[PDB]
Design a protein around this ligand. Structure first.
Ligand SMILES: *[C@@H](C(=O)O)[C@H](O)C(=O)N[C@@H](CC(C)C)C(=O)NCCC(C)C
Length: 212
């Protein structure tokens, strides 16, 4: 795998979104991955519906939090609509999939990256954008204004994001707090410090969609 990876440069990442005041981080994260894999597999870059996940993944708790793995299982079993068909409203409403026509895309499965192992995550990332979680509750994470983030931070994961690249000493993450946060809405998190949890516990739980 290359020393530097940036799916943004391969045209496999769509613009940065804002989840607003709805705990929909999990939906956001899952979509970053679907968007990526489709581009990688088909050559088209489409935006997919986070709202669709928010309203339809009954295993998650809407604006109260959720599971990227669950969201991703949903897309593999049923499929998902384009973002314009089912735009984001930042509030949970009934599932309108059928109301909206046939799904735009379907994946084949979901896989877990072996946890607390940097090498395994970098490998996956080299393959496609991956759903990852970290501890975002601390003020330092929140007031992040750019640079290589190194903490301070515990490993009390509570936020789902997506890993879209890496370099020599960091992992490139796409957040969903708007373009006004961090590095134009991205964060470069320090990698290779030997902490098995990963900084902010970045290696606790990572998934990615499978598409034949
Ligand atoms: C992320 C966001 O801010 O949207 C969101 O809070 C999330 O999905 N988070 C995990 C939060 C931690 C505090 C553990 C999560 O908790 N997942 C399930 C949450 C609830 C019990 C409903």
């Amino acid at each position: 795998i290359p020393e530097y990876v940036d799916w943004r440069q391969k045209g496999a990442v769509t613009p940065v979104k804002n989840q607003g005041s709805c705990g929909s981080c999990w939906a956001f994260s899952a979509v970053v991955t679907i968007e990526g894999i489709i581009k990688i597999r088909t050559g088209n870059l489409n935006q997919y519906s986070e709202q669709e996940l928010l309203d339809c993944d009954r295993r998650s708790y809407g604006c109260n939090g959720g599971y990227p793995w669950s969201a991703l299982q949903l897309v593999a079993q049923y499929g998902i609509h384009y973002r314009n068909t089912y735009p984001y409203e930042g509030v949970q409403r009934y599932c309108r999939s059928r109301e909206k026509g046939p799904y735009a895309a379907k994946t084949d499965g979901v896989r877990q990256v072996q946890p607390y192992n940097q090498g395994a995550l970098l490998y996956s990332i080299a393959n496609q954008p991956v759903s990852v979680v970290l501890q975002a509750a601390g003020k330092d994470f929140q007031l992040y204004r750019g640079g290589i983030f190194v903490g301070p931070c515990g490993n009390k994961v509570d936020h789902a994001v997506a890993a879209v690249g890496y370099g020599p000493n960091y992992i490139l993450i796409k957040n969903s707090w708007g373009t006004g946060w961090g590095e134009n809405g991205y964060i470069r998190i320090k990698r290779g410090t030997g902490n098995s949890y990963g900084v902010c516990g970045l290696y606790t739980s990572s998934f990615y969609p499978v598409k034949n």
